[PDB]
Design a binder for this molecule. Structure first.
Ligand SMILES: [Cl-]
Ligand SMILES: [Cl-]
Ligand SMILES: [Mg+2]
Ligand SMILES: [Mg+2]
Ligand SMILES: [Mg+2]
Ligand SMILES: [Mg+2]
Ligand SMILES: [Mg+2]
Ligand SMILES: [Mg+2]
Ligand SMILES: [Mg+2]
Ligand code: NA
Ligand code: NA
Ligand code: NA
Ligand code: NA
Ligand SMILES: [Sr+2]
Ligand SMILES: [Sr+2]
Ligand SMILES: [Sr+2]
Ligand SMILES: [Sr+2]
Ligand SMILES: [Sr+2]
Ligand SMILES: [Sr+2]
Ligand SMILES: [Sr+2]
Lengths: 154, 140, 186, 160, 95
RNA sequence: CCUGUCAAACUCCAAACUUACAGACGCCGUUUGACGCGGGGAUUCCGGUGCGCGGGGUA
RNA sequence: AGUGCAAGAGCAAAAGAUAGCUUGACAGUGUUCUUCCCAACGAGGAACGCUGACGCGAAAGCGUGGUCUAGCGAACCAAUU
RNA sequence: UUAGGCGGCCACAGCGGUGGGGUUGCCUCCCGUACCCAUCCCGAACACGGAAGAUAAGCCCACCAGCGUUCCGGGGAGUACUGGAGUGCGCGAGCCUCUGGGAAACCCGGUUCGCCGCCACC
């Protein structure tokens, strides 16, 4: 399960690449989605590779982001252990985080909006004109690199 | 093994390449059977621009007709090694061609499952000169 | 053989056993084929149908198993060929086959030949096969008459292993008589 | 006419003689020089002139460089010196010139050139360890008459 | 193109790989397909008749009946539905 | 045999990729009716730039 | 190689050659595609049918001109069946 | 299939080569032209009739790789080329990096001297 965050805007991006992001429920910059690691989804991320940042986050990190940015499919009801426990097949955020990372369920499946609307990266990111290996922020990241970004955007 | 390997006469073709015929009558006499006309192909400067039209005649003899002919025909020639083919054929002279081959030649002349004759079963000049020379005449 | 670009004919073409152009025209009928073959000593009839991995023979008859019903004569003649066709035809009706198209393979359509005799036999067996009567030898020849008279010009029995002296077309009748009959184990 | 006009590979390959007529003859007099009866393996030293950029070299340039190079080898080793040099490229590309404005502009045929990819050997010489420096000088004079920069690379030669 | 006949620009698609050169096997020319079957369309260079417009080479249509021995195959050219008359010699079952 | 070179109108080979059909996942539609169909009204048929691939031309 | 003529393509117990026979280069009426990719538009064209009448072949079958892609022309008027 | 017939795929099946196989069995070569039929001339072939001989052809069986072909290992080669991205480099033609794909020739070693279906048959 990889976390996907759009870091580059839609202006001038190929249309089929933009439609791919939308199919992955991402419609804005800084919006994050959780995608299972399958052959089908694999082709998709590889296609949006140059306008996003993705990788597998640590259980803790996913827990922090879920706590701070997860939302109900509808309404402004805050999402916390009590909410999770009273609306999902889990006891708390941790139970959810684990099930997501292990690809046993999805946010939509548990009555949550498929997207985590993150905040701009505190302290800024490494840039959207270069990949990770070249010092940029685009493309695949380490769990530590991905956690660094997601935590900065908490 | 030797019986089905010892040569024989497939056919004796006698033909007169004229070039415009009246010569059929002698072939009909010297061989004993009806001859056939010979047409040419391709236009020719030597006033031979007519593709299909009499230009020669021939008679193909087999079995007795062939041998009864060679008996009185071979003595009229002076066979030599060069006068022999690479397949074991020889022709002299009015041309006179003798086609020799082994028993199961039919395998290449039949319609169904025909097949080409293996070089091993193909007659040889050596085997040819022999067989023939081994019957009323000399070599080189 | 010569190189990469070299074109080798289909196997059955180089073996000189299948005339594909005639084959295709045959298959276009949509009907089973009455495949008539012949060897120096024998004659074979098969009802072949098209199949996924190759043709499919539904019924057939050989001149050999003709004896199985009372035949002590040679098996490479006209009477032989006809009866074989009839035998194959009868078995054809057994398996539910009702019509066919003559496939003489690489044999010649000579009038009164054996492949046409095999056809007349298969047709009398009740099979519906497109044909032409004035191409079939006359009844008597099928029976074996032509060979009887040949033996007539005797001096030395036509047949070696005395099957009979003045040969027999009347036997052909006995065998045909035995096949057209119901009983018979096809 | 300036080489700037044809030195780049900015056009389709144009070599089909069956559809092109009036192609001027080449100015290259020889492609194999020195003692062409002797093998190349019969020499201890093998030095080539390598092109550093992909380009097109017109036959008039191949001739000038080759000439100005073999000429030196002849002057330093004699009309029969124990050496041999090879110009391994032939001018297959046909060149045009639109010589009426841009209307029906397809040009008339004016010459030929050889396409050389960077890193390739244009010339190659074979000499004895003695004349190894005379050939390096012949190439120095050769690369001065062709468009790109060149490396004088010494293949078989560990006598330094 | 310089001309607009049916065989314009069909040099490749209507040429046989040298080894497939020569009269083709009768089996595929007599094959029977059922309505509803998915069939790929591809002209066989060696077969003259029963062809469709070369422009449709590569289509995977649906047999929806037949006309004589030929088959009527339904395809969707772009967004336009068309019916193609084609003989088995130029068809192949899908999958 | 050996040794030196090529092809827009060559090909024993041969991609990336484009493309037909289908299944799967995704997205979407069944009160926001999608897909498809019928009808009313148009405007439009001087385009331009970047990037990729070009063809002509010294440009 | 040949296959009437450009080019590209097709063809070998043939689509080429020869021989013989024959007039399907036939009448009626359609389906579909093309013309005009997608996407509406005529003439013209092609492939594939049904009906009628025939030719050749043992028969399957082949023949809606020449192996395939060029060789074409509205309304009004005239002549013709 | 101790030798047969009709095939599908249509060279992994081609080219070439070696060895083995047949008394009333099979396929053949083979023997022979009164007939049906046949040759622009030839019972050569086609067609018919037949068993004195034979396993030399063909054919079937076992096998060999020199040429041709198929697939595969290792090397060439993650090279050549390339879909997506870049305020990376270059005077420039052009190159590079990241991401996703990825040859061809050729060499060396293997594989390949058909596989499969239906019917018939000591
Ligand atoms: Cl047969
Ligand atoms: Cl069509
Ligand atoms: Mg909301
Ligand atoms: Mg920055
Ligand atoms: Mg092309
Ligand atoms: Mg007017
Ligand atoms: Mg008039
Ligand atoms: Mg032997
Ligand atoms: Mg710059
Ligand atoms: Na004549
Ligand atoms: Na073919
Ligand atoms: Na029309
Ligand atoms: Na044998
Ligand atoms: Sr240009
Ligand atoms: Sr220079
Ligand atoms: Sr394209
Ligand atoms: Sr036609
Ligand atoms: Sr004979
Ligand atoms: Sr400059
Ligand atoms: Sr790969």
């Amino acid at each position: 399960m990889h976390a996907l965050v759009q870091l580059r805007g839609e202006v001038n991006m190929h249309t089929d690449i933009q439609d791919t992001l939308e199919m992955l429920n991402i419609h804005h910059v800084n919006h994050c989605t959780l995608v299972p690691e399958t052959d089908a989804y694999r082709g998709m991320v590889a296609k949006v590779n140059d306008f996003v940042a993705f990788g597998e986050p640590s259980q803790e990190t996913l827990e922090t982001v879920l706590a701070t940015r997860a939302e109900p499919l509808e309404g402004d009801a805050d999402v916390d252990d009590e909410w999770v426990a009273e609306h999902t097949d889990y006891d708390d955020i941790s139970g959810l985080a684990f099930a997501l990372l292990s690809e046993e369920t999805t946010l939509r499946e548990q009555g949550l909006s498929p997207t985590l609307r993150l905040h701009p990266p505190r302290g800024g990111h490494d840039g959207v004109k270069h990949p990770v290996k070249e010092g940029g922020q685009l493309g695949k990241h380490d769990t530590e690199g991905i956690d660094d970004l997601l935590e900065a955007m908490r | 093994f030797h019986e089905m390997r010892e040569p024989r006469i497939e056919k004796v073709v006698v033909h007169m390449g004229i070039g415009h015929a009246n010569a059929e009558d002698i072939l009909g006499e010297i061989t004993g059977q009806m001859p056939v006309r010979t047409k040419a192909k391709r236009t020719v400067g030597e006033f031979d621009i007519r593709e299909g039209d009499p230009i020669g005649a021939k008679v193909t003899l087999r079995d007795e007709m062939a041998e009864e002919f060679l008996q009185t025909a071979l003595p009229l020639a002076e066979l030599a090694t060069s006068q022999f083919d690479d397949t074991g054929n020889f022709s002299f002279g009015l041309d006179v061609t003798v086609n020799l081959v082994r028993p199961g030649y039919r395998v290449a002349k039949r319609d169904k499952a025909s097949r080409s004759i293996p070089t091993k079963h193909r007659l040889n000049p050596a085997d040819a000169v022999a067989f023939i020379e081994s019957t009323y005449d000399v070599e080189v | 053989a010569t190189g990469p670009r070299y074109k080798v004919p289909m196997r059955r073409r180089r073996e000189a056993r299948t005339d594909y152009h005639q084959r295709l025209r045959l298959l276009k009928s949509g009907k089973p084929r009455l495949v008539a073959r012949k060897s120096n000593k024998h004659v074979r009839a098969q009802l072949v149908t098209l199949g996924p991995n190759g043709d499919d023979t539904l019924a057939s008859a050989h001149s050999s198993d003709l004896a199985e019903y009372g035949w002590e004569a040679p098996t490479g003649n006209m009477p032989s060929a006809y009866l074989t066709g009839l035998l194959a035809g009868l078995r054809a009706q057994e398996a539910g086959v009702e019509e066919a198209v003559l496939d003489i393979g690489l044999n010649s359509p000579t009038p009164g030949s054996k492949v046409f005799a095999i056809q007349e036999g298969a047709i009398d067996a009740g099979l519906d096969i497109p044909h032409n009567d004035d191409v079939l030898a006359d009844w008597q020849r099928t029976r074996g008459a032509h060979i009887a008279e040949y033996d007539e010009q005797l001096e030395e029995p036509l047949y070696s292993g005395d099957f009979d002296a003045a040969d027999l077309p009347e036997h052909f009748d006995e065998l045909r008589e035995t096949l057209l009959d119901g009983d018979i184990e096809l | 006419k300036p080489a700037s006009m044809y030195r780049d590979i900015d056009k389709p390959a144009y070599t089909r003689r069956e559809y092109i007529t009036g192609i001027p003859g080449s100015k290259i007099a020889q492609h194999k020089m020195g003692r062409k009866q002797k093998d190349a393996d019969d020499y201890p030293v093998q030095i080539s002139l390598i092109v550093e950029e992909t380009v097109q070299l017109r036959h008039g340039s191949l001739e000038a460089s080759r000439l100005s190079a073999n000429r030196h080898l002849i002057k330093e080793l004699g009309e029969e010196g124990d050496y041999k040099m090879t110009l391994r490229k032939f001018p297959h590309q046909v060149l045009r010139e639109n010589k009426d404005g841009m209307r029906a502009a397809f040009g008339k045929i004016v010459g030929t050139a050889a396409r050389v990819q960077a890193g390739e050997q244009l010339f190659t010489a074979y000499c004895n360890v003695e004349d190894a420096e005379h050939v390096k000088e012949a190439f120095r004079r050769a690369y001065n008459k062709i468009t790109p920069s060149c490396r004088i690379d010494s293949s078989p030669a560990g006598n330094a | 193109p310089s001309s607009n006949g049916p065989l314009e620009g069909t040099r490749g698609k209507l040429k046989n790989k040298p080894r497939d050169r020569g009269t083709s096997p009768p089996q595929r020319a007599v094959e029977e397909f059922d309505d509803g079957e998915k069939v790929h369309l591809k002209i066989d260079p060696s077969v003259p008749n029963g062809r469709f417009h070369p422009r449709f080479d590569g289509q995977t249509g649906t047999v929806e009946g037949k006309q004589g021995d030929a088959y009527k195959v339904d395809i969707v050219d772009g967004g336009k539905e068309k019916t193609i008359i084609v003989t088995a010699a130029h068809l192949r079952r899908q999958e």
